[PDB]
Amino acid sequence: MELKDDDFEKISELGAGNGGVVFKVSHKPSGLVMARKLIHLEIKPAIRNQIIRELQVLHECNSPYIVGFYGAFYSDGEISICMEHMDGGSLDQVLKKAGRIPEQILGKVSIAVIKGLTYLREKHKIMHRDVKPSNILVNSRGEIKLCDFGVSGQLIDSMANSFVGTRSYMSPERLQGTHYSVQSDIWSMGLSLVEMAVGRYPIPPPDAKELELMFPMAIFELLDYIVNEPPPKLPSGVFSLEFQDFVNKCLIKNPAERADLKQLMVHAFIKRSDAEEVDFAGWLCSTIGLN
Ligand SMILES: Nc1ncnc2c1ncn2[C@@H]1O[C@H](COP(=O)(O)OP(=O)(O)OP(=O)(O)O)[C@@H](O)[C@H]1O
Numbered sequence: 001m002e003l004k005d006d007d008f009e010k011i012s013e014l015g016a017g018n019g020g021v022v023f024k025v026s027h028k029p030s031g032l033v034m035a036r037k038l039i040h041l042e043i044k045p046a047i048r049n050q051i052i053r054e055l056q057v058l059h060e061c062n063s064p065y066i067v068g069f070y071g072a073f074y075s076d077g078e079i080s081i082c083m084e085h086m087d088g089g090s091l092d093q094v095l096k097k098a099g100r101i102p103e104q105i106l107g108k109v110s111i112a113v114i115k116g117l118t119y120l121r122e123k124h125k126i127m128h129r130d131v132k133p134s135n136i137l138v139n140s141r142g143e144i145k146l147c148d149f150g151v152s153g154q155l156i157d158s159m160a161n162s163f164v165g166t167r168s169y170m171s172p173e174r175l176q177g178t179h180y181s182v183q184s185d186i187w188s189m190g191l192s193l194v195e196m197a198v199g200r201y202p203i204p205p206p207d208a209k210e211l212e213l214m215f216p217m218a219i220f221e222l223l224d225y226i227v228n229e230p231p232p233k234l235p236s237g238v239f240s241l242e243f244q245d246f247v248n249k250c251l252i253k254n255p256a257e258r259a260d261l262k263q264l265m266v267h268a269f270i271k272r273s274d275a276e277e278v279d280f281a282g283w284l285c286s287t288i289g290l291n
């Protein structure tokens with residue numbers, strides 16, 4: 001069935017970012033619980049019809065690594081996108097509580113992210129454009145899923161003005177110009193894994209002293225660090241060398257030299273992690289407190 005504003009009822013607010021707020025809602029006619037994301041745009045009706053039009057391709061997104069989609073519409077000045085409610089929230093929220101995320105678990109996260117990007121490229125000819133821990137959602141069934149990928153050109157265009165004035169997961173090439181594509185997602189995945197693995201945004205790297213204890217920056221300063229100074233890496237010894245190599249292959253500054261999805265799919269770390277027996281669902285609930 002078609003979704004519309006009056007058929008919904010707010011339960012609670014799940015969080016907000018730059019340019020969007022997300023509610024946990026009840027869709028009254030079905031009784032289903034959903035996550036309704038609102039993007040406040042005031043923009044000419046002509047193009048906001050185009051946006052809703054372009055967003056309908058998410059009905060063709062069926063994948064165990066992509067958040068389910070229920071529908072998209074326009075309301076009182078707001079674009080609504082209604083997704084599956086992921087009761088374990090995002091990986092940035094999970095890292096927040098967990099402090100630091102185990103390597104074995106990150107292994108399963110990498111598999112989900114890799115297969116996720118693969119589906120999007122294969123079945124839809126699109127890159128993600130915003131891979132970061134807040135955009136990898138998990139739930140009590142143990143499923144790890146991507147959302148907030150860029151399906152609509154007009155939306156991408158209509159949002160270009162804002163962005164994050166700190167912490168960038170953008171690749172060096174994206175920061176420097178318009179010449180980027182799927183490879184740029186590999187960089188963001190790499191950076192996200194390092195963050196989750198260590199427990200804080202990895203730029204700048206920790207001191208020798210900050211490291212042993214473990215185990216603000218200005219905009220141009222941070223960006224200049226991403227572009228010119230050597231990429232971040234996993235501290236030696238306390239992560240397997242397969243995992244270190246894995247992130248190293250993701251964090252190569254040159255997009256063509258950098259590993260791609262097909263190569264990462266067969267990396268020793270993924271191959272090791274595919275075999276591993278991990279109660280992800282159990283680890284999730286036991287850390288963030290669910291059932
Ligand atoms: N489908 C969902 N199920 C459960 N929680 C969600 C869902 N989608 C988003 N959220 C939560 O809502 C919050 C806000 O999401 P939103 O995508 O607006 O911004 P963000 O991903 O936090 O950061 P940014 O705005 O910079 O992209 C996220 O932190 C996430 O925890």
Ligand SMILES: Cn1c(=O)c(F)c(Nc2ccc(I)cc2F)c2c(=O)n(C[C@@H](O)CO)cnc21
Binds near residue numbers: 018058069148155
């Ligand atoms: C271009 N684009 C999009 O095209 C887009 F679809 C987006 N959303 C989206 C995509 C897939 C699924 I499943 C659920 C979503 F909410 C999207 C998006 O969410 N964001 C994030 C901001 O709203 C921050 O709050 C940015 N661009 C999006």
Ligand SMILES: [Mg+2]
Binds near residue numbers: 017134135148
């Ligand atoms: Mg987001």
